[PDB]
Amino acid sequence: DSGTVWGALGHGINLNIPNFQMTDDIDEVRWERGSTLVAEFKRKMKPFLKSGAFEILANGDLKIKNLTRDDSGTYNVTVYSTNGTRILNKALDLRILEMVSKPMIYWECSNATLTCEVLEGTDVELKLYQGKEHLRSLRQKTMSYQWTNLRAPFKCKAVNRVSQESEMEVVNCPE
Amino acid sequence: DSGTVWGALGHGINLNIPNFQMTDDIDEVRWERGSTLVAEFKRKMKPFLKSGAFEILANGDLKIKNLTRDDSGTYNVTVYSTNGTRILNKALDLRILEMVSKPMIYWECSNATLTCEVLEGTDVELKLYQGKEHLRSLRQKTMSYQWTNLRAPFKCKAVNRVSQESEMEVVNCPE
């Protein structure tokens, strides 16, 4: 059956076979992304790998080395015992995202407005905190908040499923 | 005899047997943690590994795949020749740490105070530099320094045995 996995572009990920345990009676495990065999492990063989991009691990997990936009999609694992029987057939959804960069915080004293902004990343949420209160969150790469007090630093955190990065600044206005 | 080894949480580590070389004259090498045999290599036999977390390498090194706060402690290696002589018995201290995150630098012009702060890490030391002079070090995740001049940018470095991460900012106060 299908679950969801999130990976970061240009990094590795390990697709692990759901609620499984490996054992000496397992003759085969094969991984197909969509309808393409990507890797196949057969107990007594050096494995079949589509390319150098994939590697089949000791316990049958698919290890993709450096994710590419062509690697996302529905993967399928089917594993067979020695008496050739299909033990399992499960499906996973690989979705890949881009990592976030460190946020920038800048401000404008006249309108008392602070802006937090980030350059890198995908499906980014930007979170603002001042001291220990969470001020605002937005799924945007740029966010502006009009302050009420300046008793504490502001913290801006940029986050997505695959990364997190934060910044702090004190609004330091001419008075 | 004994040594210390440092590993990062959620990463792998190889505990190598100091100044040893594997030859056909070695019959056995065993690795123990507390009252458990974690892994054992014995000559005409198949390896004993306590669970899937460990793997015993070709040369007898212990490979722990994904460090967990519970994996730290004294590990013992004992290796034996084919004629039953205990060739070696060495002890190693596995200390596992959390990797440092990138420091955030923010500054307050009124009291001319700069603050360097880091969110992630364990056994962290913060190191402050302005230009080429080392300003201050503190074994804390937050450090504050009141400046004298602003002719150079500040650089704050967060470091611990298993990681290091730096940042730079130019204090830019209104006149």
Swiss-Prot record, chains A, B:
Domain Ig-like V-type: residue ranges: 1-98
Protein name: T-cell surface antigen CD2
Keywords, sorted A to Z: Cell adhesion, Cell membrane, Disulfide bond, Glycoprotein, Immunoglobulin domain, Membrane, Repeat, Signal, Transmembrane, Transmembrane helix
Subunit structure: Interacts with CD48. Interacts with CD58 (LFA-3). Interacts with CD2AP. Interacts with PSTPIP1. Interacts with FCGR3A; this interaction modulates NK cell activation and cytotoxicity.
Glycosylation sites: N76, N83, N111
Disulfide-linked positions: C109-C173, C116-C156
Domain Ig-like C2-type: 99-175
Location of the region described as CD58 binding region 2 in the Swiss-Prot/TrEMBL record: 76-90
Gene from which this protein is expressed: Cd2
Main localization (coarse): membrane
Function in brief: CD2 interacts with lymphocyte function-associated antigen CD58 (LFA-3) and CD48/BCM1 to mediate adhesion between T-cells and other cell types. CD2 is implicated in the triggering of T-cells, the cytoplasmic domain is implicated in the signaling function.
Residues of the full protein shown: 24 to 198 of 344
GO cellular component: cell surface; cell-cell junction; cytoplasmic side of plasma membrane; external side of plasma membrane; extracellular region; Golgi apparatus; nucleoplasm; plasma membrane
